[PDB]
Design a protein around this ligand. Sequence first.
Ligand code: IHP
Ligand code: IAC
Lengths: 91, 571
Amino acid sequence: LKSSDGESFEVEEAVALESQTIAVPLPNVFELILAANYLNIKNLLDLTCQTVADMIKGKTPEEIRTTFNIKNDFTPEEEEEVRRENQWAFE
Amino acid sequence: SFPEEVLEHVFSFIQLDKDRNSVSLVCKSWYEIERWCRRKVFIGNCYAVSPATVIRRFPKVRSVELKGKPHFADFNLVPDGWGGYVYPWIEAMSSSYTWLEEIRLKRMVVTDDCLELIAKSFKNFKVLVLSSCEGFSTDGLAAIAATCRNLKELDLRESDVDDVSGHWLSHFPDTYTSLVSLNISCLASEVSFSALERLVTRCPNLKSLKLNRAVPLEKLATLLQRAPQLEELGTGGYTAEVRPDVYSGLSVALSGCKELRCLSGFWDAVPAYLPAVYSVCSRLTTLNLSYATVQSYDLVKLLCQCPKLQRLWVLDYIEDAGLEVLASTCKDLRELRVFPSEPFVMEPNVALTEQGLVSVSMGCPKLESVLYFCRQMTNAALITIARNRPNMTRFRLCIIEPKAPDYLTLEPLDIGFGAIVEHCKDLRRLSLSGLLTDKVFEYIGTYAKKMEMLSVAFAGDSDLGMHHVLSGCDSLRKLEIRDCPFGDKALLANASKLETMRSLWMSSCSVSFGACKLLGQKMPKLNVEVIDERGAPDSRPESCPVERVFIYRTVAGPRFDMPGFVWNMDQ
Ligand SMILES: O=P(O)(O)O[C@H]1[C@H](OP(=O)(O)O)[C@@H](OP(=O)(O)O)[C@H](OP(=O)(O)O)[C@@H](OP(=O)(O)O)[C@H]1OP(=O)(O)O
Ligand SMILES: O=C(O)Cc1c[nH]c2ccccc12
C-alpha cells in the first residue's frame, strides 16, 4: 500500500481486505472519517460516524455549528419557519 | 463538514425527534440531508399539521405516530364526531410512503376503510398499534389478518371495536408466521380457539401475547406450551372449577416460560388459581392486577414473591397493609397505580388511605410515577411523600370526593401539593384534587418549572390561579381543566403562552364566547375551538360561558372536518 505522500506500508492480505476499496496506491490518504469512507472500511466508518453523532446528540443548532465550524445560511425568517414546524408539528 | 454520504451515515445514529430537529437547523445542507433520511415521524396533535406538509418534508418515512383527541376524551368530555379521523392521513400516505412499516395511532377514529387501505397499500407493513381508537370492526381486523403478510404487531389496547365476530383471526393464512406481539384484550368476541392455537404454534418469534376474556383459564396452559419463549402474557379469563389437574397443568406451562417478565389479564380471577403464577414471580418486572377483584391478603401472597417488580397496577383492594408489604419487598419499584374498586360509593369499601402512599414513598427509593385513587388525604402525608421522593416525575392524585379538604385539619391541600412541586424538581406531570384555592397554583407557577402536563378539576378561586400557571410554568405543553372558576382574564392575559403549548382544554369553566372570539382574532396561528351542543354560540349573549373550548397551535390552520357542534374562531 502506497500513501498520498509517496510513503509505503507493509500489511498482510487479512488487514488489507478490510478495505473494500483496496480489495496498491492510495492517493487520498475528520481526516479519519474521510479515510474510512474512501477505503470503504465498514466498522471504522461506523465507529467514526457514531463518534461524530455523539458530538451532536443533545446539542442545539448553534452549538452543533460552533463545534463543526458551520455558518448559519438560513435567513431569520427561514430559521423561524423551520423551528416552528419542527416544534409545533414534529416534536 | 463531510461528503453527503458520510453525514447521512452520521445521522443514522441519531434517532431522537429533538436531536433530529436540532440537526435540521444547523444549516440548509443538514436540513436537506436530514429530511431525506428521517425514518420516523411523531405527530402529537394530528390537527397541528397537514399530511401533505409531512409527506413533502420527510419523503422516506417508514414509521408514523399520530394522536387525535385530547386526553379528557377518556373522561367522556369530547362529544362523538368531534374529529381525529385518520383516513386522510392514510390516503395521503397510501400513494407516497409505499415502504411504510409502522402506524401507531392514539385516540383516532379508524374505520374498516382505513384498515383495508393500509392492508392494500403497504406491502412491508409490520406494526399496527391502535391505542384507545374507535370506529372500526372485526371485519377491518379481518382485512389486516388476510393481507399483511409481513405483520409483526397487532396491538389493540383499550380500543372500542365493533365486535361483529371472532372469525377475523382465522384469516391469517397458514404461510403467516411473523407475529411478535398480539394484544386482543379489548375484544369481546371470542376468537376461534384452534385458529389461535395454530397461530401461536407457527409463530416462533411471538414475544407478547395478550388475550381476551373469552379464552378461558382451562385453555391457557395449551397456548403457553406452544409459546415457551413468551416475555409478556395477558391471560384470558381467570376462573374455573378448582381442580388439581387444572391448577397443575397451568403451573407447569407457566414455569416452562422462563423469559416471562410481564403479566396481566386476570379477569374474574379466583384466589385458588393465582399461585400457578408463582414460578414466574421472581423474575417479573410488570404486574397488572387491575381487573382482579381479589382481596388484600391474596395480593400480598403474590407480591411477596416479586422482588424484581418495577411496575404495579392494582385495585385499592391492596389496602394500606398490602402497600406496606410492597414497600418492604419491592425495592426496585418505579411505578405504582392504584385504581378504585367501587368509585361510585362515597363511604370506603376498602381500608386504603394516604398511609399506603406514604409507606411506598418511604420504602421504594426508585418510585417516580404515581397514580393513586383514595378517599382521604392530608397535607402532612403529601409533605412526607415530597420529602421522601424528590425524584418523583409523575404524580397523579385523585381523591374521590371533589373538594375534600385535609381530613384532619380541614385545610385545603394547597400546602401538600406545594411541597410536591417544591421538592420534586423534575416533576413533569401533575394532576390535582381535594380542596384547592388559588394559592396551590401560585406554588405551581413558582416551583413546577419542569412540569409538562397538568390536569385540574374542581379547584381554584379565580383567574389569578390559571394566570399563575400560564405565567410561571416554563415547560408546560398540556393544560387540561374542568369545572374550575377560570374565565376570560388569564386566557387573554397569557395569550402568547398558548403558542408554546401543544394544547389547552377547558370544559365547564366560565370562558365566555366573547373571549373565545377575541382570542381567535388576536391569535390566528391558534385553532380556538368552541365545542358546544346547545346550538350556535351566536344565539346566546357573548358573555355566556361556552360548554367547552379546546385551543391548540397549528401550522395547518382551521381544520376541514369540524362537525355541527364545533366552531373555529379564526377570522
Ligand atoms: O409524551 P406525550 O405525547 O405527552 O404522551 C404522554 C406520555 O405518553 P408517551 O409514552 O406517548 O410519551 C405519558 O406517558 P409517561 O411519560 O407517563 O410514561 C402518557 O401517560 P400514561 O403513562 O398514563 O400512558 C400520556 O397518556 P395520557 O394522557 O392518556 O395519560 C401521554 O399523553 P397523551 O395523552 O398526549 O398521549
Ligand atoms: O390523572 C388522572 O388520571 C387522575 C386525576 C386526578 N386529578 C385529576 C383532575 C382532572 C383530570 C384527571 C385527574
